[PDB]
Design a protein around this nucleic acid. Sequence first.
DNA 1: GCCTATCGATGTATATATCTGACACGTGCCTGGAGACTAGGGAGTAATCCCCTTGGCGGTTAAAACGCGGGGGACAGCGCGTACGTGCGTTTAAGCGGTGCTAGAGCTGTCTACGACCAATTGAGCGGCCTCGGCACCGGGATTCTGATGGCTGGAAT
DNA 2: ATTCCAGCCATCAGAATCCCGGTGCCGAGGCCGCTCAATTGGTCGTAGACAGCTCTAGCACCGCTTAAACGCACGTACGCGCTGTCCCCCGCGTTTTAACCGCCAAGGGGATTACTCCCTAGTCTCCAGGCACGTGTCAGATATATACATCGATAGGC
Lengths: 95, 93, 97, 102, 78, 86, 105, 103, 663
Amino acid sequence: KTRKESYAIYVYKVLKQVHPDTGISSKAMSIMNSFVNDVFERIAGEASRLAHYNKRSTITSREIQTAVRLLLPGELAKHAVSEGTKAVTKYTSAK
Amino acid sequence: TRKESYAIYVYKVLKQVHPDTGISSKAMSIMNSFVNDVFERIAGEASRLAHYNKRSTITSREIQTAVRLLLPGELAKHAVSEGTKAVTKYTSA
Amino acid sequence: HRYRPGTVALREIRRYQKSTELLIRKLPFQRLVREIAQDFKTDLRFQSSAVMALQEASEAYLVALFEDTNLAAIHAKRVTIMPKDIQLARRIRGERA
Amino acid sequence: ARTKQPHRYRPGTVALREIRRYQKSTELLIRKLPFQRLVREIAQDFKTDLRFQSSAVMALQEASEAYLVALFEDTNLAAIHAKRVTIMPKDIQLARRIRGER
Amino acid sequence: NIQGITKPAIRRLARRGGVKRISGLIYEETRGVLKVFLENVIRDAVTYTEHAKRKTVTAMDVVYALKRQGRTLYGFGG
Amino acid sequence: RHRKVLRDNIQGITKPAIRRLARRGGVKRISGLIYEETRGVLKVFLENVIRDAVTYTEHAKRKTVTAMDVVYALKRQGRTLYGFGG
Amino acid sequence: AKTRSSRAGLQFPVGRVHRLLRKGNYAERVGAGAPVYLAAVLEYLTAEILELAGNAARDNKKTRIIPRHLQLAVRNDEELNKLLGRVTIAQGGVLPNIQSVLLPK
Amino acid sequence: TRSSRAGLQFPVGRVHRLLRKGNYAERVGAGAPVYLAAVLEYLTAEILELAGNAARDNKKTRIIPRHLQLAVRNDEELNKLLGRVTIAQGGVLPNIQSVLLPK
Amino acid sequence: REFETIERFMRKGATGATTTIYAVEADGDPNAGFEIQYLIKWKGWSHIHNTWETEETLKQQNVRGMKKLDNYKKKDQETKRWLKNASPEDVEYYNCQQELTDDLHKQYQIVERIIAHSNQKSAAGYPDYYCKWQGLPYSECSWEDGALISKKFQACIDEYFSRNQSKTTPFKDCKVLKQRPRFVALKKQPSYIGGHEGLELRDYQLNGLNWLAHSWCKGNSCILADEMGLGKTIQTISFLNYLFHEHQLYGPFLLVVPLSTLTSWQREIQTWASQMNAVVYLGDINSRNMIRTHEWTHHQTKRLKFNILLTTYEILLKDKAFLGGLNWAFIGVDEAHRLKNDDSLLYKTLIDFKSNHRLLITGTPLQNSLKELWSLLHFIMPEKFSSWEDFEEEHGKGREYGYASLHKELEPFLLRRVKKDVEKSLPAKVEQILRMEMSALQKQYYKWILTRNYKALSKGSKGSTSGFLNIMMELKKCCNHCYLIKPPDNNEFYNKQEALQHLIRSSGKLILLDKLLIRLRERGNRVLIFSQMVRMLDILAEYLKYRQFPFQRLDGSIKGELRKQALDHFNAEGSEDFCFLLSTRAGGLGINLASADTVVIFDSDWNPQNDLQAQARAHRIGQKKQVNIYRLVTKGSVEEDILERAKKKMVLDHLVIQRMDTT
DNA sequence: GCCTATCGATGTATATATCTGACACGTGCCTGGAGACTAGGGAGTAATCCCCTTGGCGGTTAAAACGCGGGGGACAGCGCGTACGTGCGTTTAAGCGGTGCTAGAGCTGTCTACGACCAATTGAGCGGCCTCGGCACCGGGATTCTGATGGCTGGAAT
DNA sequence: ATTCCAGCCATCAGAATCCCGGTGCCGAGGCCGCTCAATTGGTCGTAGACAGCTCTAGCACCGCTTAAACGCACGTACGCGCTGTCCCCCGCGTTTTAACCGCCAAGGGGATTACTCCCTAGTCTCCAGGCACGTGTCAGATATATACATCGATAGGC
Ligand SMILES: Nc1ncnc2c1ncn2[C@@H]1O[C@H](COP(=O)(O)OP(=O)(O)O)[C@@H](O)[C@H]1O
Ligand code: BEF
């Protein structure tokens, strides 16, 4: 059988980090995977359109930032931007 | 500097359909915007089709399917007929 | 003994809003889907997941339309839904305009 | 030797005339300058010292007028549904809720 | 076959929608609107299937068709 | 004499303007409470559009909002506008 | 001739469509027939809109197509209204329509 | 590895691969995938926290689509993000209009 | 695939007809014993029916509109309560305002010009006459009894009949246009100029009239740039009168006079050039229609009746069509620097007007660039200056000989006489710049603005941060007075004597200004304040109301009809008004005030020529006393920065201009 | 309580004659499309084989299906009263013309950092299993509605 | 002086979830091994970051007209409450039809893999579509025309 990739092992780690004594069934996991895919696709499309509009060939972190701000509501957008900034900072620290 | 648009081609189409009629500048801008919008919509549908079927290329068939998905009914049928005729004539060269 | 009209209606509302199961019988829905598809291409086959997905989507759409219909009915100071409510809901939604 | 020694239209006649006139005419209805003022005021809350191209305000005005016109059409349908002729705020509320605006 | 969507089923769907009293004419309208929704979804589903040169309509085809129609469905894939 | 009072900018969308927009929509009779509701709805719409427009402008390192920014913002909301670009 | 639109017999630029597809990051490859097909589709849609626009203009005794004519053409056609259902044409106004319940008998 | 360097449980390499083989842009920045992974992880964490709270409120200990639906529809921001999304087996939020209730 | 109606709301027994002008002459006031009422006002009848009436007379006749009395009651109660609490100085200000206002109202009663007469000869000898209103537009014209008008305004009917019977009115065809006649030298003032009063033109005026006549005989138009204060308009009307008499040329004339200067031109064309009929083409659409009906065409011959029109730019633009066919020979323009930008619609409008002689009247035509001067020259003779590039290359900057070439070529087309070269009697102008340090509040607001820390300014203020998109115009406001950027909180002080102290200390400039005004008050010298910010005028007016005598105001919002009264009251002998608040662009141009000894420039315009224009309002022919000019400058601020540009420009302009004289 | 008929007058429409700006063609040139040619990966097959969809069948409940009675909503006709439309005189401010400035929108060009494309290599994540607990079931347990007997009195009626 | 509907509580049958314990499935969640995809290290060449420079074109007044907004008056049309009649649906019982489940069997189509060759991307030279800019002048914007559908609504026909 060929391989179907999924975020199951990642959603499960997140669940076991927010609720150690909790579990998730096979359909809730599919729903979560679909949600991740949809958010990915919408953010990526926003980044691409931002790049094309601004006549640029790269999808930079700033593109993702503007995409997140455009797509998510205010509070979710702010928290997502903060977490993305922290992640980028840590990634650049180990340089 | 140079900005490129579909003005002259829409004008040729107008002077084919309605030789006497003219077209105001804002109408021309509207037509240009409509062409761009339909272009991007069909291109996006074709791209999604390619990615889904795990293809790497956009062919006339993908565009045909995108037209069938987007345009409704007689509009889609006539668009498909025109596309097939155009491709056939292109090959006939 | 014999409940006044309305009590059992609210009982059903509570029963079904609380629950999650599919409300339409599966086999009639499969037959309807196959009949609709027949007009497009003969010999078509359907995965079971495809039929279930169509059923879920149809149920969700109908429930949302019924919520809008109920809102429309209350607007006219009525309590009973009737076709013109569905028509208004659809037109405002843009589905039938 | 000066020495010093009416017609009235009924309610509704002018409303129909206005309906026809403004369905015919495409001219912008909201006064441009107060709309520009409101646009700038709102924009201030997001980024101070913003500048607007003259076409940006025009585009916003066109979009806002079209949205309001569509909303008024839906509201009128809602009012007729209730067997009324006057549009009231609950009509707009119903129209928005059905349309899906929160 | 559309009659397979019986009066009790529409009753239950209305209940889930918060409807307390249902007129006798809602049923035909519900059947018609359901048929229209199914036709719109299924045409796109078949179109997707035809492009793949397939004969079985997969769940992914339905998901794509719904996503076109603004009816994004989570639970089967995307 | 003038008391230096100034009317709110939102009040600049005057009662006749809402009346005319209603007329284009086919409204014959208008309740007096519609006007505040219309003002609020228009303000919400403008806020939603201008937020995206400002975001687009900030991305470009621009300090001026261009018509294309408004077009893109409206397209995001599914309200594509023609006649100003594309 | 030396121009790909002449071969297909279209007026729209087949090479420009090929450029846009090739540069739009829609796919990693673009076939030779896809530009021709898309150009033909765009040309047909433009012709269909312009026919109705010119008819509407001639109805008003005009000779130039203005946005009002385009809006009338789009909104009076069931198919074009679905395709352009969420499109607002600037300076196009709205179709004349007064509900029966408002006018007197 | 490229996720531990960012402290994200989600995969940065898979996001990078999808961005490249996704027909989104000609080239993809180093920092973009980390940002996207962080955003996705945050959204998943929020949804899962609300779902687990709902499950606790139901005395279950296994998240099922009902819980996700309840969490999403009881949060205004999440409901607005997923307005056009229908969740299988999600049901509906209990809501009975007052006018239908008895006096 | 019907009863009358009340117009407005302003001893016992004096009422009705007996109080009207038909009987008050024979009986005066019926009673003047030791309650009080206000002037009669009826909707539909002319004001000339002025009488004293009581509350009961309206009721007796059942006049419809009694319900309107409630607003008048409200006004009366408010005035009664407010006046008692008003401070004695404010009470005096209000009393003077009322005194002026009643005089304004009465002036309407004086008939100016009979417009039409009815064929119905009342009493077989008294046709009904259509009477014009003094100070009111043609829209108010109403017919009045011929006998009634004759009793009080006999002379006007004689005027209208004599003009109607006259034949001096222009004619469509003129032989002079084909070929100009030979020049004749005017050695002395013709006896007909000045009338029986014997008014004599000043010598330089006679020389300029001779020059203009010589230029006309050659068919070449000219620009007149006499230094401000020498009476350009007198020379213009003199040229017109010369064309009238000494050439029998009664052709159409069109003087485009600014709005502020319209009344001066009208008065001077009535005193001088009395042999010509003038039509002030001002007012609403209906009034212009009335003029175009009655005073435009001689229906018995379809000939033009008028001689000289008096239009403004804003009106001429909005009726450019009608005049386009009735080509005028002498299309004159006053305050012509508006034509410095050829793209301006006035230029494109007038350039399409077929004219035989155009004379521009501008005090300072040099302006900021040679292109403007070229534009005016083009307006003179479009054929000779039809090309800009040729002129630019022909007059390349830098080389010294080019300027002398310019001064040679201008001489036949541009005439200008400095004051010192034509009238030494005029006192020399005094220019002084008084630096002033910004106040502490000014410094704090300035610090905030420079840092753009809107958070501070926004405290308790509705100001919009987006209003700071032009930091220069807000720095200027901060320098002038704090209240412009942040309105003062009226709740801080309830006693006026304290709020005045805060207002004075709020602006550094006022610290010098109040002392300067008092010191000039000691001398008895009147003061003119020119400012280019209209809110500044409001601030200054509020400050004045507390302490000093009533002040007149002149800004663009003041309707034209009132400007006449304000100017006359300030100019009239025995005036008590301490100072004049004049907006620069509105009131700084053209008007002949010549009744003040101080000209204070609160804020400097970006263009020094406007400032110089303002200074010359006082320094005119009528001055018998020297005028001191004080230019206010805030030390340590951008105002000095502007002055530096002004200095550079002024030095260059003087260097160029001085080359005109053979010194 | 109704049909028709004219103007308290009224506002669209359908005719001219200006005039005026936007629009339909022309002309130079410079970018972008088109002829060549090539390399090589992806698409196109023909085989193979595995699942899973389709179709049978028998029992077996659950649901759907009728049929009846009677309650309470739908819906019509009536009646106040107020708030909405229309219209006028007065005012306000939009709109436009003219005057200033200059912040900042677009471009060119330089060169440097950071992605792309390679190659070895290595460990995360995938499919394949495996074995208990979470959650179905299902009782009888409790108890929470709920509608019809109920007590009373105020209120309008007798 | 006397009294029965709505009505505050009432009180007692059922009729419902729900609450609980059993039992017992099977789908989770954990472990194993091994692939292939991500990581490390290297060169390599162009995005794009930054700088310097030109002008659109965007902002802030004043001034002045004049059309649209505003405030107020009048009255009448519409809204909203109300009452009453009727029918249409709900609720319940009993019968009939059909889902639903479980075990089973087939073979068709999805999936996969080996191998091939054709069509596309990348590079180069060379113009002629295309566009910016200019321009001359008809179609439309704009005055002044009367002509034509009626707010009624007044007066006379029954
Ligand atoms: N020829 C003259 N004789 C005496 N006084 C004159 C003469 N010409 C003008 N004036 C004075 O000039 C004043 C008018 O100024 P005027 O020249 O009209 O101003 P402007 O600068 O607008 O032309 C009058 O008050 C009058 O006294
Ligand atoms: F110099 Be004048 F008074 F115009």
